[PDB]
Design a protein around this ligand. Sequence first.
Ligand SMILES: Cc1cc2nc3c(=O)[nH]c(=O)nc-3n(C[C@H](O)[C@H](O)[C@H](O)CO)c2cc1C
Ligand SMILES: CCCCCCCCCO[C@@H]1O[C@H](CO)[C@@H](O)[C@H](O)[C@H]1O
Length: 166
Amino acid sequence: SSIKKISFVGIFSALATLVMFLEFPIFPQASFLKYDPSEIPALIVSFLLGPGVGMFVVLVKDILFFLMKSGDPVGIAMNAVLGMSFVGIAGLIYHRNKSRATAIKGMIVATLFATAFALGLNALIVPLYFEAPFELYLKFFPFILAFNLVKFGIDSVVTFFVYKKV
Ligand SMILES: Cc1cc2nc3c(=O)[nH]c(=O)nc-3n(C[C@H](O)[C@H](O)[C@H](O)CO)c2cc1C
Ligand SMILES: CCCCCCCCCO[C@@H]1O[C@H](CO)[C@@H](O)[C@H](O)[C@H]1O
């Protein structure tokens, strides 16, 4: 209820900023791809309060996380760009047919989109970030694909066993 909800968002984003400190590289080769489950707070916020609010959370989350981990602008900007895209799409699908069907149809789609958005993004970033030629990206390609497919897929199914578990 306005003031009651502003605080709810504020502590959930500050909750996600916390969870972002258990980030681990999962892939030993790809030390740049690091998994954190902080996209599960925003996915919950996006379902209750709307797609724009969910992106606001991951936006402020990564800003705070960047203020505390000052030294990864492009990486954090990548996580913010991919993160905002994951929740806003999942929020939008859920948000015209309250039917629980749109909950998973949005997560299946959002997981696929954010995965595709990551490959296209890294295509002109992994060359630029490592100041390398385009072939390095292609060495990393199946790991970038498997990562964001697993990261957002896990976040999709974990948020579902949160709604289930009630
Ligand atoms: C080159 C680079 C590529 C990244 N690619 C992805 C990605 O494909 N999917 C994802 O979820 N996060 C990705 N990240 C997010 C990363 O785990 C997070 O931003 C770390 O905080 C990097 O500092 C990427 C980060 C960098 C630096
Ligand atoms: C609007 C109310 C929503 C409920 C919020 C309670 C906490 C967040 C939901 O799940 C939790 O998230 C953590 C971080 O990702 C996980 O580590 C943890 O295992 C899991 O239990």
